[PDB]
Write a new protein. Sequence first.
Length: 903
Amino acid sequence: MKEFYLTVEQIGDSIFERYIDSNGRERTREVEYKPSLFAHCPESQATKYFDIYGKPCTRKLFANMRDASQWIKRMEDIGLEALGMDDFKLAYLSDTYNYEIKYDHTKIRVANFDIEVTSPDGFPEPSQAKHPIDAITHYDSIDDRFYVFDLLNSPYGNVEEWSIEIAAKLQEQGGDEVPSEIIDKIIYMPFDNEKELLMEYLNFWQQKTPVILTGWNVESFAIPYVYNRIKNIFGESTAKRLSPHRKTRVKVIENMYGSREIITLFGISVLDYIDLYKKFSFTNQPSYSLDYISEFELNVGKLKYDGPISKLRESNHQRYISYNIIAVYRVLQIDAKRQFINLSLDMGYYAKIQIQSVFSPIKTWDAIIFNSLKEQNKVIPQGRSHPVQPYPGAFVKEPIPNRYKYVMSFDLTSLYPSIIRQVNISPETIAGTFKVAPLHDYINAVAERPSDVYSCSPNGMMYYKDRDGVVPTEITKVFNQRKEHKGYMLAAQRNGEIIKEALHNPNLSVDEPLDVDYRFDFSDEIKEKIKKLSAKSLNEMLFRAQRTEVAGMTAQINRKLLINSLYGALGNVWFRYYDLRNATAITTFGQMALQWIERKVNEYLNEVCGTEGEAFVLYGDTDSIYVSADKIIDKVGESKFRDTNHWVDFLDKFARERMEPAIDRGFREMCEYMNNKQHLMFMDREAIAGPPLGSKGIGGFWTGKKRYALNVWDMEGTRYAEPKLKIMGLETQKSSTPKAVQKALKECIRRMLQEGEESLQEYFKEFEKEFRQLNYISIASVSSANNIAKYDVGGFPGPKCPFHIRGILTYNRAIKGNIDAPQVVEGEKVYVLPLREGNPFGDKCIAWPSGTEITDLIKDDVLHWMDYTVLLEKTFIKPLEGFTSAAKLDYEKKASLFDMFDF
DNA sequence: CCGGTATGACAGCCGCG
DNA sequence: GCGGCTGTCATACC
């Protein structure tokens, strides 16, 4: 076991480092680290240090870190480059850990915790911490225990002690249904007053100081609340004790709407799971509360309870504590499934960064490049300031709004990283420029060949073809490492496949499993010894083969995340290797790539189908094209297929045997045209879409850019048993659309694509007939409540006040003076309903808090004055009219066809 | 340094016998 | 009394 770091920090002239030593003990170092930086020298000086341009550099070794930083300032003032790693934590990490870091998670203290604060005032602001903390649950990964700190006496009540016996019983029995997996792991400790609880929490914290601190919302609530509460009661000194190094910083995050405060605790890595989830789940969610996320991932959700949470400790303290325990457990259950902390650990040690820096593609890439360049004796350039300048981005084709019967899609693989490698784009790789013609001209191969000597992008940039680029090289590494780890993973699974055959009939022997590497396939010497081994040993071989498979995935998805990060970093002015010209070279090349192939696919299909000038490519967005396949079917006739699977087979074969070769030679022409270093434009078939054979369905339609629906039978080789709707952009995918309406519109779209017009019309009619019988919650729109006060003038709407905001103000006037009525809060989500004119309320609409029923003190009148006609038109009929117009279908039996013209 | 390329709901304005 | 704008806001996705 070789030693690894936990946290690193710079305080004045010292690095403070937490680490696990070569014996496995957690330890702390103070090091007066001596940094090196670099300046340019004359050719006469014999150094081994060269910058990325091959210019000689001299190494300046500093007495301390403040001198290095002051030297940087003096170089800026003189106007000469100061080269080298200016974040001395990274340099320190690279010097102390100059090898492939292998870590052991079991020795890393990972804490997740959750706080409860009874507040009759509303949401208790963490910057004020006005109210007692009346519960803390704190899970420690090393102990494997939940530590529960419970306040028995507060201004808001004196309560009984929580019962673990009651907590384990069923909900039918008065129990809390706390799972038996964690019941034997709760360490319960009650307290007579807040001061005792808080001081015991602090001492506990010093004995078990988190390396990684997590939990749902910990960074914007729990941490700032605990810190400020302790601060207000005991003083700043006592609050600083939450940092291993007694150093804290009050950071004010100034988001482009308001401002909030987070507290930096020096010597701890905070990885808020809500940010970890938003960063690595890659699934857009209507809500990011723990409830919605828990039920999505675990199909269980957060614990239920009666009445407002501000009254739960008074009325049912038993529930209150258990609810706090389950909350922490939900976060752990999610992490058991998604494993985002491991992910963070793996990448942090890979790049050799502070773990919390995994949230920064810039820091990560900076460190990866810095490190490999260090080991070649190369010197990184000074980070330079650049003005934020918008540049061309992705090409999106304007589609003709229509129905499309048969559609086949194709994707460029890793487009932008591929373009970097193909063209050899890198700061030190710029060779010159050429007179640029219109993009159109390069797309049609009419413009003159830019260069015979250099590799080119159509923004006018030229790059050396000999030199290996710093950025292209570093990204190629990551590519290779991914294939490598995926090569171990498939072998680790296929090695377990042979093991499962031996699971049928083994024979007992007192021995341990033989020495094998599951990263590579078994030899015939090992294969003969498979059946001979014991039943105990074969279950351990299956254990370790699967353990090898888990090591592969984490490695290969991390590398995937880097690949998809690089462009982002390269487009950022704060990135060391950023160059505006290079950025636009990437996107512009991408724009040409997609349209040149759209040309090639159209030309190939026209010739093969006999026709001329017809548009086969109906749509294209960034890296993907969508191809109309109607003519390819009509060439064979649709009456010649036996079932749906037949024509799906036909199109599948046709793409692979006819179209993909046409594409490959199409891009090779483009590579030769731009004189690029290597050909890396590869395209995979994704989707085959169309209507069921012998049905009246239309298969698919586009209404605009990024707004379409397809009936998909196959996605990249995998054939679906039942057809799957792919819907992008449409109201069905919007969280603001009422629940019943999202359902009704999806069925409308299903009927259009699979069943046809008559089906749609029968449904629409019926839904209209039955609309008034649906629940008022299921037919209400949802919105976010931003800037309430801005449009609020004495309890009434002001200039430019949005519709939902108006609704909120109608509600507030209706509940004015009623404290027990649910309050509408800034930032939160609201239900919105239109109201009939003449209503006793103020306005044309009302809005109440989402996820809840309206107060009974207003419910009857809301239900009475609800404007069904307006609600149906606004949320259902109008968006449907959009779909049907584009698909050229009627949703109502007799609609005039002169409605479709601009008279 | 933990947002491009998009569409749609809606407010409010402008010409218009 | 309503298209034809512009502007604010809301929510999608790679």
